[PDB]
Design a protein around this ligand. Sequence first.
Ligand SMILES: CC(C)Oc1cc2c(OC[C@@H]3CCC(=O)N3)nccc2cc1C(N)=O
Length: 286
Amino acid sequence: DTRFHSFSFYELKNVTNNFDERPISVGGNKMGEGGFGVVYKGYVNNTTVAVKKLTTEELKQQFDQEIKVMAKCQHENLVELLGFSSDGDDLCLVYVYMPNGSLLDRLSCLDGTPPLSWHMRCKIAQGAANGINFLHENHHIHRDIKSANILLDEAFTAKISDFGLARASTVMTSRIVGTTAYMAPEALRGEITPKSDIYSFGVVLLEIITGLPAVDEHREPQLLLDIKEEIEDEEKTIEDYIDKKMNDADSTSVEAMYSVASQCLHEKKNKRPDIKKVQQLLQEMT
Ligand SMILES: CC(C)Oc1cc2c(OC[C@@H]3CCC(=O)N3)nccc2cc1C(N)=O
């Protein structure tokens, strides 16, 4: 019993051009994808929507968790679920359309979008921290904080997405989930704690500052979190790493954001700031 709309799988099929997997640029409907499904642009009730079409019973479990979590969690910095479909060939989740896609894609300037300014990145960092704070205050652990899970609306406001693996908040688990290049050491060992979301958020902050992905094989070092070491050893400077695709960054506020990222990335979970402290530091930054 939720306020979400039950759609016919056939209507979602019809409005996405039969789930046309080609990218939007070449005439299709595919906007992106991530582990459990493909995300399509649709048009329902005169409204643009995003339709995510999703092992086995575990997939139904992530569909149910996404719905249960979204019913309990509504906030300015969380993506809004509109409805779902379970009556056809496959499970679908329907959301408000995010015209600016994901932070990951906007940082890479995917499809030719202009680089995000430093002014916009600071607003995005603050928004995402506000969304995590809401989750934590409501005893939820996201478990998959990453730039692909921070969406951007019509005003480039950060909207946290993908609540399929979210947990009710420390304990251990037999099923270790998350994205390795963003995971805290205790999460890779099976610990479940909101302290891990802070670590993953530190990685997202490093992506915002540098414009670099969390992992790059043909790059060296391959993992972004390792720059914290290059810098502390005075081998490099955060300045050497600032994204060159901005014309408005200023050293002081960049260094304040790097300081927050550095505190988030403490290897010892108990030494990390909690989300309230992170929100505060990002507010003083601006
Ligand atoms: C709530 C999700 C389904 O909504 C979207 C997701 C997207 C996306 O997703 C990348 C990954 C996989 C799913 C996810 O949440 N993170 N990449 C690119 C564009 C996306 C646009 C929307 C949207 N609501 O318009």
